[PDB]
Amino acid sequence: LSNNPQGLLLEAIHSAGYSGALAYPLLAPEAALNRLDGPSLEEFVAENYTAPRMVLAAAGVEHEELVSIAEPLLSDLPNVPRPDEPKSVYVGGDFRRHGES
Amino acid sequence: LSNNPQGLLLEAIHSAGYSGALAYPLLAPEAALNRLDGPSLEEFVAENYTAPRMVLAAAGVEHEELVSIAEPLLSDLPNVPRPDEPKSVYVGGDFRRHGES
């Protein structure tokens, strides 16, 4: 990953400035990469992929046929309400990482 | 190197909280290691390993014997003017490095 310092700096800004929900990394550090599992992903999806968070957008598709095809395949999901939004607070921060370049 | 964090932190403190002389690292970073060479060592030794900065100390040796064997081996070194010691100021802040969990 080190070959793209721009993305690294953007991620470092997020990690070092935000605290919590927005400071959570986006690129799966080594330990978490080692620890992740199929059941972990399955539980994450089952808990977070609920109906009030599904939007089926179409670009050049007629509405009538689109809904006629996507109603049977989606109307049977459980109606789990939206959880509380993950709150984060912005603080200062200084990140610094030496390397070869 | 990471197996002993104490030495790493001593080196880090020296580098961070000194500026030139004491800040010069002791464990030869990778770029310096690649740059280093035999002729460079030759020149460094020939420039620095001079007589006015050499002490030969014995622990269990008669002084007469030691001097009688050492004078025919060190008396002909060139007399140099002992170039001055480097300067270093203390003002320094923080070093932070992220590793294992």
Side-chain angles (χ1 to χ4, degrees):
Chain A
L1 61 83
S2 181
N3 296 115
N4 201 354
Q6 291 78 16
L8 294 176
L9 270 194
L10 185 63
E11 189 79 25
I13 291 171
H14 274 89
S15 169
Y18 269 107
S19 75
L22 278 79
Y24 282 167
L26 192 62
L27 296 182
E30 269 286 345
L33 186 151
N34 193 9
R35 166 197 53 77
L36 279 167
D37 288 329
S40 307
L41 289 192
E42 211 163 51
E43 210 199 348
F44 182 86
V45 163
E47 294 192 33
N48 282 303
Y49 282 22
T50 59
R53 295 187 282 174
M54 311 315 278
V55 183
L56 178 73
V61 176
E62 273 276 14
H63 198 75
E64 301 294 340
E65 68 173 1
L66 168 67
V67 65
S68 82
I69 305 314
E71 196 186 12
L73 283 76
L74 288 174
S75 66
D76 69 82
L77 283 176
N79 187 260
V80 190
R82 314 201 50 111
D84 49 39
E85 291 172 321
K87 293 328 296 163
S88 167
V89 61
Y90 167 78
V91 308
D94 171 33
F95 183 91
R96 185 175 290 108
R97 188 52 45 154
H98 206 286
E100 84 292 351
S101 60
Chain B
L1 179 51
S2 89
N3 290 318
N4 174 259
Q6 280 81 355
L8 190 153
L9 278 189
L10 276 296
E11 295 316 304
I13 294 170
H14 278 89
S15 82
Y18 271 113
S19 76
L22 280 299
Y24 286 136
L26 187 45
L27 294 174
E30 191 206 0
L33 187 153
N34 273 38
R35 187 212 42 259
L36 267 178
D37 206 354
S40 168
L41 288 199
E42 288 183 358
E43 191 201 15
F44 184 75
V45 163
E47 171 203 329
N48 281 296
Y49 284 18
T50 45
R53 47 202 284 170
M54 293 177 71
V55 187
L56 175 77
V61 176
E62 189 72 35
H63 182 52
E64 184 36 61
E65 164 181 37
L66 170 64
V67 73
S68 73
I69 312 306
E71 183 178 1
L73 259 54
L74 289 178
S75 64
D76 53 6
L77 271 175
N79 189 2
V80 300
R82 194 201 211 300
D84 282 331
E85 61 276 340
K87 312 310 187 311
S88 65
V89 296
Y90 171 66
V91 65
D94 175 25
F95 172 96
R96 190 178 267 96
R97 199 62 44 192
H98 182 74
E100 269 74 11
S101 197

